[PDB]
């Protein structure tokens, strides 16, 4: 415990269990509530983003694809909309050298 | 005779069914541990494929290329070496092993005469 | 059909008669086969990632299907 959350959701988005992610978003707002009022972008953009590649949950949501995508994206968008983090979120890019510019929209049209 | 089915298709040389065994893509994931091809990249037009190469190369006893090339008795033998996990593998060693060994066998035999 | 068959059957015999000597030059030096190439047994399916030795080829256009069959997160020649 207390470290699995980054490792859980990246797999949990890949499987597509919708209601299990609702349990994952349940404690996720509580971890922001455990902070004293710290910057919700500058905290969740370390939790939604991997530490090395810069890959978000959202680009992870569109690399893999199942028939659960249309709901799994909007919930990750509505949670990104109910916290005033959306504009930094949707235009996220790879920090990694090999892919500077593989954004969320290029990976959408790739999967057609 | 101590032969796998892949060996039996080669030793009798029935070519078309051997095109199926060496390709064998299975586009699922409860049971895709039986495949012989693997797709790695999913990037529109370009895609890097992985053939599987278990008994194919001469790394064990009585392999596939040892059966195919040394054999007599079959007549469509060139129609089998068109097939992809064999066609590039002969071409592999002609880049790295054989052609550089070949002209040394020429230049040694040339000065012999 | 010497126009047709003979200059095709000469392709039929020549690729074979190359292919015999290459397999002979494998068996000629069993000294140090360090440069047999195998791509180093990447993952097949399971938690058994070190599974069995593989090879690589590449493809082109015509019938853009969608994709859940792959292995990785669209990498390149991933050396790292």
From Swiss-Prot, chain B:
Q: Where in the cell is it found?
A: Cell membrane; Cytoplasm; Lysosome
**Residue ranges crossing the lipid bilayer per the database entry:** 92-113
- Tissues in which the protein is found: Expressed in keratinocytes and hair follicles.
Positions of ANK repeats: 1-23, 59-81
Q: Which family does it belong to?
A: Belongs to the transient receptor (TC 1.A.4) family. TrpV subfamily. TRPV3 sub-subfamily.
Function, as annotated, reads: Non-selective calcium permeant cation channel. It is activated by innocuous (warm) temperatures and shows an increased response at noxious temperatures greater than 39 degrees Celsius. Activation exhibits an outward rectification. The channel pore can dilate to provide permeability to larger cations. May associate with TRPV1 and may modulate its activity. Is a negative regulator of hair growth and cycling: TRPV3-coupled signaling suppresses keratinocyte proliferation in hair follicles and induces apoptosis and premature hair follicle regression (catagen).
Oligomeric state and interaction partners are given as:
Homotetramer. May convert from a homotetramer to a homopentamer to allow pore dilation. Interacts with TRPV1; may form a heteromeric channel with TRPV1. Interacts with SNX11; this interaction promotes TRPV3 trafficking from the cell membrane to lysosome for degradation.
Name-wise, this protein is: Transient receptor potential cation channel subfamily V member 3
Q: Which organism is it from?
A: Mus musculus (Mouse)
Q: Which gene encodes it?
A: Trpv3
Question: What fragment of the whole protein does this chain represent?
Answer: 340 to 452 of 791
UniProtKB/Swiss-Prot annotation, chain C:
- Domain of life of the source: Eukaryota
Q: Where in the cell is it found?
A: Cell membrane; Cytoplasm; Lysosome
Expressing tissues? Expressed in keratinocytes and hair follicles.
Q: List the disulfide bonds.
A: none
Residue numbers on the Cytoplasmic membrane side? 9-80
Its function, per the record, reads:
Non-selective calcium permeant cation channel. It is activated by innocuous (warm) temperatures and shows an increased response at noxious temperatures greater than 39 degrees Celsius. Activation exhibits an outward rectification. The channel pore can dilate to provide permeability to larger cations. May associate with TRPV1 and may modulate its activity. Is a negative regulator of hair growth and cycling: TRPV3-coupled signaling suppresses keratinocyte proliferation in hair follicles and induces apoptosis and premature hair follicle regression (catagen).
What is annotated about its quaternary structure and interactions? Homotetramer. May convert from a homotetramer to a homopentamer to allow pore dilation. Interacts with TRPV1; may form a heteromeric channel with TRPV1. Interacts with SNX11; this interaction promotes TRPV3 trafficking from the cell membrane to lysosome for degradation.
Give the UniProt family note: Belongs to the transient receptor (TC 1.A.4) family. TrpV subfamily. TRPV3 sub-subfamily.
Protein name per its UniProtKB record:
Transient receptor potential cation channel subfamily V member 3
Q: Which residues of the parent chain are present?
A: 679 to 758 of 791
């Amino acid at each position: 415990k207390k470290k699995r959350l980054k490792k859980r959701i990246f797999a949990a988005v890949s499987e597509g269990c919708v209601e299990e992610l609702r349990e994952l978003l349940q404690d996720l707002q509580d971890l922001c509530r455990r902070r004293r009022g710290l910057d919700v972008p500058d905290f969740l953009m370390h939790k939604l983003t991997a530490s090395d590649t810069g890959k978000t949950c959202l680009m992870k949501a569109l690399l893999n694809i199942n028939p659960n995508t249309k709901e799994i994206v909007r919930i990750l968008l509505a949670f990104a909309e109910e916290n005033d983090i959306l504009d930094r979120f949707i235009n996220a890019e790879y920090t990694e050298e090999a892919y500077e510019g593989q954004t969320a929209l290029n990976i959408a049209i790739e999967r057609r | 005779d101590g032969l796998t089915p892949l060996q039996l298709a080669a030793k009798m040389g029935k070519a078309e069914i051997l095109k199926y065994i060496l390709s064998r893509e299975i586009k699922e994931k409860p049971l895709r541990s039986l495949s012989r091809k693997f797709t790695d990249w999913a990037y529109g037009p370009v895609s890097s494929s992985l053939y599987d190469l278990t008994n194919v190369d001469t790394t064990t006893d009585n392999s596939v290329l040892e059966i195919i090339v040394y054999n007599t008795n079959i007549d469509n033998r060139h129609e089998m070496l068109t097939l992809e996990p064999l066609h590039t593998l002969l071409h592999t060693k002609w880049k790295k092993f054989a052609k550089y060994m070949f002209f040394l066998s020429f230049c040694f035999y040339f000065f012999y005469n | 059909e010497t126009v047709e068959n003979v200059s095709k059957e000469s392709e039929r015999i020549w690729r074979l008669q190359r292919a015999r000597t290459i397999l002979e030059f494998e068996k000629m030096l069993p000294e140090w086969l360090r440069s047999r190439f195998r791509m180093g047994e990447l993952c097949k399916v399971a938690d058994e990632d070190f599974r069995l030795c593989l090879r690589i080829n590449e493809v082109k256009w015509t019938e853009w299907k969608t994709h859940v069959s792959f292995l990785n997160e669209d990498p390149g020649p991933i050396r790292r």
